[PDB]
Structures are given as structure tokens and as C-alpha cells.
Amino acid sequence: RDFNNLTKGLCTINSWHIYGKDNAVRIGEDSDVLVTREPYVSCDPDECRFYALSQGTTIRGKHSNGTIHDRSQYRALISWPLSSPPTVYNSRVECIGWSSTSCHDGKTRMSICISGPNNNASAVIWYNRRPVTEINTWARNILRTQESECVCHNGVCPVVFTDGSATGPAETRIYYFKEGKILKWEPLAGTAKHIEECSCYGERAEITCTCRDNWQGSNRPVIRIDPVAMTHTSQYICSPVLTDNPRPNDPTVGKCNDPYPGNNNNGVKGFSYLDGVNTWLGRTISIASRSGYEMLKVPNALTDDKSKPTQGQTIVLNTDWSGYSGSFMDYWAEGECYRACFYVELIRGRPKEDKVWWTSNSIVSMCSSTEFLGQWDWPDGAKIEYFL
Amino acid sequence: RDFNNLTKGLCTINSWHIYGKDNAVRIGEDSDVLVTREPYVSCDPDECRFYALSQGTTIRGKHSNGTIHDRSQYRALISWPLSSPPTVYNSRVECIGWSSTSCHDGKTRMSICISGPNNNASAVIWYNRRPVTEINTWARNILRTQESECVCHNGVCPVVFTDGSATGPAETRIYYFKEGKILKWEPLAGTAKHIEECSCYGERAEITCTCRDNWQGSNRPVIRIDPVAMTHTSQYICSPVLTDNPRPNDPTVGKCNDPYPGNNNNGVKGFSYLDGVNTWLGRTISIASRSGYEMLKVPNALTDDKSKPTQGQTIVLNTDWSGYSGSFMDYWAEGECYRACFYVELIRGRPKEDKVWWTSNSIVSMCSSTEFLGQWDWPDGAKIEYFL
Amino acid sequence: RDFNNLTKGLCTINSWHIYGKDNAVRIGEDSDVLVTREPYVSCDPDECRFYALSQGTTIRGKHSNGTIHDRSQYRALISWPLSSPPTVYNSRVECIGWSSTSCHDGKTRMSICISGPNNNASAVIWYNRRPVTEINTWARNILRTQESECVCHNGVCPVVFTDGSATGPAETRIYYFKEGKILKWEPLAGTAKHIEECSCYGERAEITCTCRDNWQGSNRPVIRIDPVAMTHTSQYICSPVLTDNPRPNDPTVGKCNDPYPGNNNNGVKGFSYLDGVNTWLGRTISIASRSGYEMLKVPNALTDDKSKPTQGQTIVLNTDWSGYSGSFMDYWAEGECYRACFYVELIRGRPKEDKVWWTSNSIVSMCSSTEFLGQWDWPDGAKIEYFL
Amino acid sequence: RDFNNLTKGLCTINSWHIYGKDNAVRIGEDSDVLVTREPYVSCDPDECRFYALSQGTTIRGKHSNGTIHDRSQYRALISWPLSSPPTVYNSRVECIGWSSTSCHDGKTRMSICISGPNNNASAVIWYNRRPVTEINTWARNILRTQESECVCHNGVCPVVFTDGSATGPAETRIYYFKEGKILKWEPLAGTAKHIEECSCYGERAEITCTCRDNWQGSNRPVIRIDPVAMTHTSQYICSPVLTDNPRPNDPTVGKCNDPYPGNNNNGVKGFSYLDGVNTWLGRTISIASRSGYEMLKVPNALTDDKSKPTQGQTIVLNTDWSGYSGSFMDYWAEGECYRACFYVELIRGRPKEDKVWWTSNSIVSMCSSTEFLGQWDWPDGAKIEYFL
Ligand SMILES: *[C@@H]1O[C@H](CO)[C@@H](O[C@@H]2O[C@H](CO)[C@@H](O[C@@H]3O[C@H](CO[C@H]4O[C@H](CO[C@H]5O[C@H](CO)[C@@H](O)[C@H](O)[C@@H]5O)[C@@H](O)[C@H](O[C@H]5O[C@H](CO)[C@@H](O)[C@H](O)[C@@H]5O)[C@@H]4O)[C@@H](O)[C@H](O[C@H]4O[C@H](CO)[C@@H](O)[C@H](O)[C@@H]4O[C@H]4O[C@H](CO)[C@@H](O)[C@H](O)[C@@H]4O[C@H]4O[C@H](CO)[C@@H](O)[C@H](O)[C@@H]4O)[C@@H]3O)[C@H](O)[C@H]2NC(C)=O)[C@H](O)[C@H]1NC(C)=O
């Protein structure tokens, strides 16, 4: 009925409880489960659903051969019920393409899909399940967007796109949409040198995005957006708890306005919640590969270049595969504050598990508690051996 | 609540963006996907769906053997969610038969299915998912209709039927339906000599249909219907850009009131949008077989016998299979104009790929943009080798 | 909102058009289709659906072995969308048991299932999807009911049950339900000597049921019910067009108040519409087995012991298997009269096709037209060879 | 709209009619049926559904190997339509974990799932399909709850948890929830020495739970809760008809305030309805293993230490496998009283049927009749041989 406004703060995060898990690769061993990657979670006023990019085949399908590739004409943004797997029969196609984002503005859902060849890609912006606006590539090198949910405030839904080299300077823009129509866009500003795959959340009329500097930085860039004035800034997470992957070992002191060096031309989508003392960062446990996942509480991580962990929680053990991670919240829950949530993609298959010809994933998802809850670990749970 | 009226013009078409794609044959390699052909897309006020004629078997089913045949007791008009495949479990049967059309009039949906033996076929007209009216064959030779969506204006939904020889003079009629009841019908008029498979769209109280002259013409007949006066005329596309298949090479000058010769007794369902300078034609790239698909902008194609392309877009490369194509629009979108759309059927299997015993298809679908978007190609994406 | 009343007459029946067909056995060759039998069709105010008794296994399932048996703990009345097959994933269980009926009273649906051992069976009467009333066996020999839809009038839904021997005198009762509660019951009256499987329809405040005399009669008993006075009578179809199976050849003169002899202890569920000159009977074409199906127009069949066909239509050829047939109408359609409809069950497998270990069926369904439509035949379409 | 209140008494129970049955293991032999255990049935104001804990694989899936284990990261509370099987495509995930309960309070549904490692488990309380409250383990030894539906009264939904040893003293608590928020909790009181898996029902503003004393008792503990004063008491079923399994033979006299001895450290979830003369108990027929199920009418079982059966009904023969059983009622049915219902889990596979590597179950479910209905038996109906 009315546009949602970001009128609350974050709840205190004293730990993380299980929210959803699909067990897709297990289940898909003997059922009609789509091959996917780049998942996320987004809420409507009445429902939260899983989102991901289909590869246009089932996992047991012979067409699953070659699904390590990221971009093809057979991909599409899909959604499905929370904790169900993405099956042929239960999945709903939001739009066609190989990079996406999606959010609800209180009245209806905007979904964005980018398709095309590397040098001639275009985004299509859907609103109320109809195409409304199209944007052509501006740098002719894999126009791409967040791969997790955007956030709206009084109808304004900012979205971060990047076009250009993944391994050098690129052209990043922030589009401000309303009802699927472009109100304004800006080129990126502040001190982040490279931006990919922003994970966003909203509180008290401000939208905070934690991104991946694929070019230089093993600390993560952060973009803070004011959706009323439609302006933004950027910087890095100051903390020496480094949260990209691959990365170097943790130092004693980080950087606020520059990439922390030691790894080039690589990374992974990740996230944080940045709320003074109530600040928690996600990262893979391995500094070398996408394995494990932990949450660490790092007070003032954004602003304090010496900040270190005061608490943590294991989400996925270092002996199990992880992947992309991202942030969402249910902005339509009852109560005084917004409950921080995230998902972690559990990649299975290639390249790490190359006895199969496919790549897919399952999802685990958590939300914050004000209690100090016991922790478990939450692995994909499939046995590659069964797929041979 | 109220009947839809065709009160808007076409938007300017400066290119075509991806709308939907089902990847049915890929997916159906290892899931319960119905064998289909003769697909289309039609919108309701709240939903757009895929439509097609089922063959009453799955593709991996042994009953898929012999599905090259067009007419059997096992076919039915089905619909399903946009960009999902037509599966056993998600498909809804609109009605029984082997030739169809369907449209929504603003209040509810009319669907028409024709069944029977070649010399004793009948159409059944469903309205609000109940049978309302039946029409018997008048020429006792495969009564047939559009195989894509009809268009309504203030409750009046015209529909073009043909009965008679596919390879000589036939009896074409235009029925004007309202609430599933025949208001009036007319025999075909003007200068089109043969009509099959009209693809229709509506703008500014006029319904334009681009058809297939299976008998003589490699230019396409066009029927223009006035749904208020319930009258019509016909002619051919004047342009020397010839849009049937098979066809001869393009000449320098076409015909307005006569079939352009060089091919007999063959063709394919196709479409155009005919709007002065804002005119775009579809065609297969091959003049010999149903392969490739392109859009060409041909200003005043309907009226200018020398008109040639000023812009184009590749939809399917000449090394990939195509098929029937047709027009639809979402008449219930917001905005000042109607957005032209189309689909192309991607036929796989027989006769061209005869190492399998079946024929099926997938669908790609596009809509117009006012931007100049980059192009990709959109092939079916299945590997026949996997079905052996 | 309000109870439906039977305020209209029958439309004139000048032929029969195709309504629905599921192609279940074809489709079920390679998809998760339940084994069924004893199907029917029933309408709600917004929907018509297929109904049948599941056997609690899929057809390709190894548990399909032995599904020739009629009564087990694994059966259940299911419903599913019109012309879809009864799959594991789309079928809704109305109630548990091995004999049923079901109807909507304008406000909600009553469904009746009978289960139990042969000598201790019970009916459970569901209303608004809750159990409301239970009836115990009165003769301790396979309490059984109609196996097709009942008919309601101002909330009163009569239902015919039989309990006792199938091969000699039995105890037949007519229960008058309202909101699932027994208003009244009566023992059978008039001159019908044995009753099984009544097929019912309603017009002008009267409910007409055509049944099967399994004991003696190859003419069919008819029960006419007045749902206001809650009274009834019975007789036989006078016509020498004999409509049970197996049966003797047609004589020149039939019987009104006695079974026509020549076959004992056998039969099949069937139906008619009995409306003076507008009277049509169904029957198998074979006098020996359940093969073929035809409609014959037999003016005054109910009352004229010499009446013979004046028109007919083939529904299923004598070289294809048939089965049970029954009547339904959409009482909630628009228009001045009720459109007569029926279904025919197409039994496949045992006993006639004993190279498979199962028995199942598909459904074809027709409704009346005021036109004289061409006829086709409507066989199941599956190839037993594919199931070996 | 309004909170439900327990304003009615129980109907007279003169026997039990069939309610629902899923035939899941039969069906799942050749369809995509989830492996489950610990099922139950719960009603909403418009729907009753099946509930159970998924194991995160299909039964034919290779991941079904090892599903005898009770607690893993791959489990989840699911629900699905009544008498359908729990398939991949029709099942809805209520929440993640390996022990649960769920009820509707008249306005919406509360669902509780417990997950974690044995010494660090946590419950998450969902209300209106959002997480609202979390509780950490208090005794660090498999925090666990009812495994069947809770009962609400004016928004207050009590729930019994146990944490601690299964084979000695444990810490049992009764949480009183409203809208998913803890109003109050109490430690267990009265004379029950050990509590597991309470089966609850509600009548006349009182909630009665029949539980399992896993430590010492082969009679069952009973907890009676007053949801207005939020207080409770406990005792045992006095009757010498002993209802746990395994158990000793029935004595002539039981115990009211102490465990009846003869078996230690074992049991099964079960239930009763305790309503003076209208009292019925469930139990396995075997005193040694989970096989068979019967209902026995035992007047004043709760209060009379010499009470014996006056009537009974067989539900599952002693030659067929049973399992957990539990109570539910449709609190939103029409009529003057509440109809007692129950379900029995039919366990198949390990440990008893160890030629397969899995454990799963199907469900049978019954409700009370005021008639004296004939009885049948209701076995799972699957053939293990088919799974080899
Ligand atoms: C039941 O469930 C509960 C809930 O889950 C379980 O309890 C949880 O247990 C986990 C696991 O132990 C805890 O997570 C760890 O938390 C610590 C932080 O806690 C410590 O630090 C605090 C502050 O220290 C600073 O200030 C204090 C004084 O204020 C000062 O004394 C100190 O010297 C320092 O300057 C302390 O406040 C805190 O104490 C409190 O709580 C205690 C319980 O834990 C209790 O006993 C106390 O009495 C007191 O009340 C505590 O000491 C995180 O630091 C740790 O994270 C590090 O370690 C893991 C390895 O396990 C690693 O993966 C992380 O990445 C991280 O360490 C890496 O990064 C660091 C930062 O750069 C670096 O310093 C490290 O060298 C290391 O780096 C290397 O590896 C990384 C990663 O691969 C790589 O990138 C680098 O390059 C490099 O190679 C854990 O998150 C939970 O906090 C705790 N939760 C609760 C509520 O208690 C419980 O165990 C379960 N029960 C059972 C029975 O199983």
C-alpha cells in the first residue's frame, strides 16, 4: 500500500541463529533441481524467498556439463520458497540474464537482469513484473551488478553497477530507481578504487554497501548511500581483520582509504554490518580458497584501523566449501529494530571438485539474535562420490 | 472489471531486449517437460504466460516418437508461467485440440481450440474457462486458426480462421466474438490470395494481422481489422524485404496487391509491426530453411514497394534452428504507449535433426526498447547428442 | 454465497464437443502419474476438476503390481485440474477409501468416501473439507456408492448407496444430506431390482440417476429423485437400445419395469440423459467387453419400449478400450439451460492387457452442442509395448 | 481475526474413522518423496496439514543412506497438504532443525525448531513465518520438544521442552508463548520423574499432555496445563493398561504418582484422551517393538489404578510396523464439541528392516466418531523387496 521507509536501527547482534537452508545439492542428486549460482535472499511484505541465477539445466542433466562458466544465454534470475530447493517445478523466473539484483519497495518488486555478450551487455529493469527501463553498457566490458538484494527508501532503490575491467580501473555507477525509472545516476566517488558485487542493508534512512575490490584490495570497500539526497561516499573497512578471499594474513593495522595489498585480481562477494560496537564481519576461514565461513564481531571495524575480534561464530568449517555471501533483512517484521541477516553460498563441483563436470551450490542463511546462542556448522552435506 | 480498449500507439522501437526464454529442451533432457509446438505468449491484466500446443507426452517419454505429426487426439492448448518450461506439473490446459488462439478482453480470457479429423473438424470457444460456442468446419479441410494471441477492443475479439486447401484457394473467415459469442463473421476481402496463421496486434482502435500465404506468396499478407465497425481489408507487405520461408532472394521491388512468386506451397508463421517509419519485420535468416531470425527496420514496409533496411538486430544466428514467430503486447502495462513484443519458436528434432524420433521446441521472446541496446543471439541451447 | 437451485432445463443436444482429456497413461509412461480408476468430473462455482480413486502408487512404480484389485487401504478419492493428469504433485486428496461421490451445493463441497473390509465398511461424509458424519455398513457386504458426482438442490444433496450382494438382492438406500448431515434416508422403491453406481444430473428441481443393475438387467435402472419432497421412484429404461455391458443383442422391444435378461452378474457404470425427444444414451460398442463408446439419440427412451436411434456419435472406436462412464454438468455456467456433459474412463492394463501387471485409465470428457458437429474418436493413445 | 479459545468439551468417542493417509513410502518408491520422521498433523482455521522432520534427501536418493540418525544439519520441519506425500515439490519448510512443534492460535501459526550440536542446541520460535524469539540450551544435552502440535488458548500457547539426560534426571520446562514471545516459564512440577515428547490437546480451557517417561516409566506421564493462570501439574496414567513401548505385561494395578517399572531407558511418543468414561488410550500391540497399534477405551484411566478396557479398535496389525503417535484436533470445525484425532507414524527401514540403508515413514490418521464403526487395519503398504 505505502512505500517502505528505513525508520529503524539494527538490533543488537549477540549471535546468529539458523534462518534457512535448502540442501539443494543433496536433494538434487535424485530430483529435478536446477543448477544455480550467485544466490541471495530477499523479502517481500508477506514472504521471504531464495533468489539465484539458474543455469538452465538440472544438475543430473547432461547439460550441467560446462556450468562453471558464468555467462550464457541459458541463465535467468529465479526465485523460490524459503528453504525449498530451486526445482524446475517450484521456481519462478524473475527475468533473463547472468547478473542481477532485486528488491521490494513496500508496494512491489523491482528486479534487474543483465544479459548479452561481454562487449554489448544491457540491463533490463522490471517493476511489478513488467519491463520498464533498459540501460546499455557504457564501458563495453561485462556490465554487472550486485548479485544480492538492493534496498529501498520511500520508493527510491539505489543499485550499484560496474562496467569495465575486473583487473584494473572500471566505471562504477549508482543508479537511483523509482518505480523502475531512473531518477538519477552518479559515477562512483570517495576512495574505493574498484567495486564489484555490493551487499547492501538499510537502517535509519541510510543504505550501507560492503563490496569486493577485485583489482587491488583484500580489505573491502564500503559505499554509504543517502537515498533521500541521492548522494553517496566510499571508503574501505579500516580493520586489519581482512575479509576478501584470497587474502594475505591479518596485519595489526589496516587501511581506511586505500586497498590493503598482497593479493591482486581476485576476490569474492561478501558483506558486513557496520554499526559501531555492534559491528560484525563475514569471511571465509581460508585465506587461500573459498572454504569455511565465520562471523567476527569487530567493534568499529569501519573507522578503527587497529580493531580486532571480541567475539565470533563459526558458520561453515574450514573443511567445507563456501562461496559468495550477502546481506538481507526483513524490513517488514514487527518490532523496534531491524534484524540483520545473511546467506552464504556453498559452492560444489568445479573447479575444486573436478571429478564432476558441473558447478552448483546450496544456501545457508542466518539472522541475528540478542541471545548468546550456541553455534553449529552448516555444510552443504552432499557426497560428490554419489554423483560419479 | 472493464473491457480493455486499444487507446495507445506503439512505442518507438529502437531495438529489442530479452523478455523471456524457457530453455525447455535443455531442461527437458532430464525433467518432465511436455513435448510442444506452435507456441505463443499472451497477457492477462496481472500476468503474462507462455502458451503452446502439447503433444500429450514428455520428451523423454517413449510416446515422443512420432510427434512430428501436427494433429492428433493427444494435443491440447496449454499455458504456463513466463520463462518456466511446460512441464507436466506446472501446465494448465486451456482446451483440447490441434490449432488455437487465445486472448484476454480486460475482464476474462477467451481461448479457442480446434480438433477433429481433417474433413470434420470443429472449433470450441471457451470464455471464462467454460465452453460457450462451437463452429463446424465449412470447407471440410483442416479448419485452422492463428496459433498466436488474438486482440480485443471493448469486448470484441476478432479471430481469423482458414478452412480449405493449404496449396490452392481456401475459405478464410473473420469471426467477431464477444464474451465467446459470435457477433458477426465475414469472408476474407481485399487482395490477399491465401491466409494462414495470423499474428495480430492492436493500437489506436485498429487490429493489424501479419499472416502466411502458404499458396503463392513469399511476401506476407496483412489484414487490418476495425473492431468497432467489425470490418476489414487485406493486402501484402509491399516491401522487397521478403519475410516468409522458404523464399527467393530479395528483389529491388515488391508487390502490394499480389503474391511475390518464386516459392509455392510452403511457408512459416511470422509477424511484423507496421507503423510508418517505426516499422519492423521479422524473418528467418535462411531463405531455404527455418534457421536464424532477425529483425529489420524497414520504414513504410507496408506501403513502399522499394523500402529496404535502415537498422536491424540478430535474434538467432543462422547456425541455430528457428520456427514460428508471432506478436503479442502487454496491453495492461503502465505508460503512454504499447510496447511491441514477439516470440520465436526454436524447433528441435525432426525433420532437420532426425537422429531423434521427436520434434519439440523452446521459446525466446523479446520486447522493444527506446534505447539502442546491444544485441546477443538466443539459441535453444540443447545438444541433440545428449538425447541419443 | 447461496445454495444452488436446479432452475434450468437441458439444452438441446445436437451433438457433443470435446471438453477434456488427460492423456494420463501416455504421459505417465515417463512421469509421476498416479495409478487410478473410477474417475469422474465435478464442478465448483469457479472450477471444474477431475476426480478419481488413486491406488496409492505411480504407474511406473513397482507398487502398481496388483492394482487390478478394487479395494485396499492405499486408495483415496483425489482431484486435480481439468485435463491435467493425476500426478503425485498436483493431486489433492478429498478423503480416504475405495468408493466415492462428491458434489458442490453452491456454498461448498461434500465428498463421501467408503473404506473398510468387505463386511465392516463405513462411509465418512466430508463437508467443507472436514469430516461431519459417518455411516456404518447395514448389510455387511461392500457398502458402496455412485463413483460419480452427486447433485444438490437448495442444500439437499441425495446420494445413492448399495450394501449387499452384487449377484442377488441387496439393500439400496437414498440418503438426503444437507451440510453433510443426514436429513432423511429411504430404502429403494419402484421397480428397479438391483442398483449400483448411479450417474446423476439435475434439471428443473428433479434429479435423474441412471444406474447399473449388476444382478439381472442389461437395460439400465433409472431413479428419479425429488430433492424438495425428498422422495423418489425407480424403473428401467424402456428402450430396446440396451446400454449395459456385457449385454445381449438389441431386441425390438424392451422392458419398463423389469430387467431385460440374457446376462447375469455383470455390468458397467454408465449414464444417460432422459429428456423426451432430447434423450441420449451412452454405451460401449461391444456387447461383450468394455470397448468402444457411442452416444445414441433415442427419443423417449425412458418411456417408449420400441424407441430406436435417430442420430448418434462415435466417441471411442470399437478397437480401443473404454470403461465406466458418467454424467456431470456445470450448474454455474451462464445461459438459459444446463449443458449436458459426460466422461468415459479408458481402462488400460489388466485384465485385457495382461502383459503389464497394472490397471489404470485415462479420461475423455464431452459436452453437448446445439450445433451438428463433426465427430472424431478419442482413444487413450498409449502403447502397452512401451511399458514392457 | 480473533484468538481461538478452548470453549468446547470432547465429543463422545464410540470409535475412530479414517482421516488421512499418505502412502508415502509406496509412492516414494518411484517419485521424489522426502525422507522423513517424527510426523504430526496440525490444523489452521482453513486447512489441516501434515507436518514432519525432513532428512534433506529423497528416499531413492543415495543421501538416504544414514537417515536412521536423528539429528543433522540437513533436517527441517516441513508441512504439506493432508494425505499427499511429502515431496520435494509440494513441501513447505516451516523452519530448520531436528526437533519441533507447531500450532495456530486463531490468528497465525507459531512453529518451533531446535537445532545444534548435542551440547549447544538452541530453539528458534517463529510466528507469522518470521523468527521472533530464541532460547539457548540450559542443560547442554539435546534440548528437545514435543514433536507434535501445541495448543493455544487466547493467544497463550504452552510448549514443553526437555534438556538433559534421556536416561536419568533432566530439566523439563514449560514455556508460555504469546505471539512468539515468552510470557513465562516454569520448571516441571508434580510427580512425573521424566518427560519427553508431549502429545497435547485442549478442551474447556485446559490443556492435557500425554508424554513419554524415557527413564523409568512404562505408564505415561501426564501434564495438565491451565493456560489462563499459566500453571500446571503432573502425574502418571493410573491405569494398568500400560501404553509405552517397550513395556512389561499389563498388571492388575498401576501407579498414579510413580513410574511403573520393568523397562528402563527407552520408550516411544504416544498419546491419550483422558475424559472420564470417554477415555481412550493408544499403544503398540507388541510389548517388545514398535509394531501394531490399538485404541482401547479405559474408563477413568487417569484416576483409577485398576481400570481395564471396555472397548477397542485395531489401527495397525501386530505384523506391521508402527512408531510415534500423537494427538491433534481441528479446533475450528463447526459443532458443539471437539473431535478427538490422532496420527500414527509407520516407520519403515532401519533398524528393523536393515536390507535398506534408510529409515523413513508414512502416516495414518484417525478421528473419533459417535457411531460404532467397523474397523480395518491401516499398514504402510510398501514392499521393502522393491527397494532392493
Ligand atoms: C557453544 O556456543 C558458543 C557460541 O558459539 C561457543 O562460544 C564461542 O566460542 C567461539 C570459539 O571459541 C568464540 O569465538 C572466538 O571468539 C574470539 C574472541 O574471543 C576472545 O577475545 C576477547 C578479547 O581479547 C582482547 O581483549 C581482551 C580483554 O578484553 C584481552 O584479554 C585479549 O588479550 C585481547 O587483546 C575476549 O573478550 C574473549 O573472552 C570472553 O569469552 C570467552 C569465551 O570464548 C570466556 O572464556 C572469557 O572468560 C571471556 O568472558 C575471548 O578471549 C575470536 O578471537 C576467535 O576468532 C579468532 O580465532 C578463530 C580461530 O578459532 C579464527 O578462525 C578467527 O579468524 C580469529 O582468529 C584469527 O584472526 C585474528 C584477527 O586478525 C587473529 O588474531 C588470529 O591470529 C587469527 O588469524 C589467523 O587465522 C585467520 C583465519 O584463518 C587468518 O585470516 C589470519 O590470516 C591468521 O592466519 C573466535 O571467533 C565465541 O566468541 C564464543 N562465544 C561466546 C558467546 O562465548 C562455545 O565454545 C560453544 N560451547 C561448546 C561447549 O562447544
Ligand SMILES: *[C@@H]1O[C@H](CO)[C@@H](O[C@@H]2O[C@H](CO)[C@@H](O[C@@H]3O[C@H](CO[C@H]4O[C@H](CO[C@H]5O[C@H](CO)[C@@H](O)[C@H](O)[C@@H]5O)[C@@H](O)[C@H](O[C@H]5O[C@H](CO)[C@@H](O)[C@H](O)[C@@H]5O)[C@@H]4O)[C@@H](O)[C@H](O[C@H]4O[C@H](CO)[C@@H](O)[C@H](O)[C@@H]4O[C@H]4O[C@H](CO)[C@@H](O)[C@H](O)[C@@H]4O[C@H]4O[C@H](CO)[C@@H](O)[C@H](O)[C@@H]4O)[C@@H]3O)[C@H](O)[C@H]2NC(C)=O)[C@H](O)[C@H]1NC(C)=O
Ligand atoms: C552492439 O550491438 C549493436 C546493436 O545490435 C550492433 O550494432 C548493430 O549492428 C547490426 C549488424 O551490423 C546492424 O544491423 C544491420 O543494419 C543494417 C542497416 O544498417 C545500414 O544501412 C543504413 C542505410 O543504408 C541506405 O541508406 C544510407 C544512407 O542513409 C546509404 O548510405 C546506403 O548506401 C543505403 O542505401 C545506414 O543508415 C546504416 O549506417 C549507420 O549505422 C552504422 C552501424 O551499423 C554506423 O556505422 C553508421 O556510421 C551509421 O550511423 C547502416 O550502414 C542492415 O542492412 C543489416 O541487414 C542486412 O544484412 C544482414 C547481414 O548482416 C542480413 O542478414 C539482413 O538480411 C540484411 O541484408 C540482406 O537483406 C537486404 C535487403 O533486401 C539486402 O540488401 C542484403 O543484400 C541482404 O540480402 C541477402 O541476405 C538475406 C538474408 O539472408 C536474404 O534474404 C537475401 O535473399 C540476400 O541473400 C543489419 O540488420 C544494426 O543496425 C546495428 N545497430 C545499431 C544500433 O547500430 C553492434 O555491432 C554491436 N557491437 C559490437 C561491438 O558487436
Ligand SMILES: *[C@@H]1O[C@H](CO)[C@@H](O[C@@H]2O[C@H](CO)[C@@H](O[C@@H]3O[C@H](CO[C@H]4O[C@H](CO[C@H]5O[C@H](CO)[C@@H](O)[C@H](O)[C@@H]5O)[C@@H](O)[C@H](O[C@H]5O[C@H](CO)[C@@H](O)[C@H](O)[C@@H]5O)[C@@H]4O)[C@@H](O)[C@H](O[C@H]4O[C@H](CO)[C@@H](O)[C@H](O)[C@@H]4O[C@H]4O[C@H](CO)[C@@H](O)[C@H](O)[C@@H]4O[C@H]4O[C@H](CO)[C@@H](O)[C@H](O)[C@@H]4O)[C@@H]3O)[C@H](O)[C@H]2NC(C)=O)[C@H](O)[C@H]1NC(C)=O
Ligand atoms: C462428420 O460428422 C458427422 C457427425 O458425427 C457424421 O455424421 C454422423 O454419422 C454417424 C455415423 O453414420 C451417424 O450416426 C448414426 O446415426 C444412425 C441414425 O441415423 C439414421 O436413422 C434415422 C431414422 O431411421 C428410422 O426412421 C427413418 C425415417 O425417419 C427411416 O427411414 C428408417 O428406416 C428408420 O426406421 C434417419 O433419420 C437418419 O437419416 C438422416 O441423416 C443421414 C446421415 O447419417 C442423412 O444421410 C439422411 O439423408 C437423413 O437426413 C439416418 O439414416 C444410427 O442408427 C447409427 O447407430 C447405429 O449404427 C452404429 C453402427 O455404425 C452402431 O454402432 C449403433 O449401435 C447403431 O446400430 C446398432 O443399434 C441399433 C439399435 O438397436 C440396431 O438397429 C443396429 O442393428 C445396430 O445393432 C448392432 O450393433 C450394436 C452396437 O454394436 C449392438 O449393441 C447390437 O446388439 C447389434 O449387434 C449411428 O449412430 C450420425 O447420426 C451422423 N450425424 C449427423 C449429424 O448426420 C459424418 O459421417 C461425418 N462426416 C464424414 C465425412 O466422416
Ligand SMILES: *[C@@H]1O[C@H](CO)[C@@H](O[C@@H]2O[C@H](CO)[C@@H](O[C@@H]3O[C@H](CO[C@H]4O[C@H](CO[C@H]5O[C@H](CO)[C@@H](O)[C@H](O)[C@@H]5O)[C@@H](O)[C@H](O[C@H]5O[C@H](CO)[C@@H](O)[C@H](O)[C@@H]5O)[C@@H]4O)[C@@H](O)[C@H](O[C@H]4O[C@H](CO)[C@@H](O)[C@H](O)[C@@H]4O[C@H]4O[C@H](CO)[C@@H](O)[C@H](O)[C@@H]4O[C@H]4O[C@H](CO)[C@@H](O)[C@H](O)[C@@H]4O)[C@@H]3O)[C@H](O)[C@H]2NC(C)=O)[C@H](O)[C@H]1NC(C)=O
Ligand atoms: C466390525 O467392527 C467392529 C468394530 O471394530 C468389531 O467389533 C469390535 O471388536 C473388537 C475386537 O474384538 C473389540 O475390541 C476388543 O474389545 C475388548 C473389550 O470388550 C470386552 O470387554 C467388556 C467388559 O469386560 C469386563 O466387564 C464385563 C461386563 O461389563 C465382564 O463380563 C468381563 O468379564 C470384564 O471384567 C465387555 O463389555 C465387552 O462385551 C460387549 O461387546 C461384545 C463385542 O466385542 C459383544 O459380544 C458383547 O455381547 C457385549 O455387548 C467385551 O467382552 C478389549 O478387551 C479387547 O482388547 C484386548 O484384547 C486385544 C486382543 O484382541 C489386545 O490386543 C488388547 O491389548 C486387549 O487385551 C490385552 O490387554 C488387556 C488389559 O490389560 C489384558 O486383559 C489382556 O490380557 C491383553 O493383554 C495382553 O496383550 C497385550 C497387548 O499385546 C499386552 O500389552 C499385555 O501385556 C498382555 O500380553 C479389544 O479391544 C471391540 O470393542 C468391538 N467393538 C464393538 C463396537 O463391538 C467387529 O468384530 C467387526 N466385525 C467383524 C465381523 O469383523
Ligand SMILES: CC(=O)N[C@@H]1[C@@H](O)[C@@H](F)[C@](F)(C(=O)O)O[C@H]1[C@H](O)[C@@H](C)O
Ligand atoms: C574444503 C577444503 O577441504 N578446503 C581446504 C582447507 O580445508 C584447507 F586445508 C586449505 F589448506 C586452505 O586453503 O586453508 O586448503 C583448502 C583447499 O582444499 C585447497 C585447494 O586450498
Ligand SMILES: CC(=O)N[C@@H]1[C@@H](O)[C@@H](F)[C@](F)(C(=O)O)O[C@H]1[C@H](O)[C@@H](C)O
Ligand atoms: C541450423 C543450420 O545449421 N542451418 C543451415 C544453415 O546454417 C545454412 F548453412 C543453410 F545452408 C541455409 O539453408 O542457409 O542450411 C541450413 C540447413 O542445415 C540446410 C538443411 O538447409
Ligand SMILES: CC(=O)N[C@@H]1[C@@H](O)[C@@H](F)[C@](F)(C(=O)O)O[C@H]1[C@H](O)[C@@H](C)O
Ligand atoms: C479393444 C479391442 O480390441 N476390443 C475387441 C473388439 O475390437 C472386438 F473385436 C471384440 F470382438 C468384441 O468384443 O466385439 O472383442 C474385443 C476384445 O478384444 C475381446 C477380448 O472381446
Ligand SMILES: [Ca+2]
Ligand atoms: Ca580483492
Ligand SMILES: [Ca+2]
Ligand atoms: Ca509462402
Ligand SMILES: [Ca+2]
Ligand atoms: Ca447388468
Ligand SMILES: [Ca+2]
Ligand atoms: Ca518408558
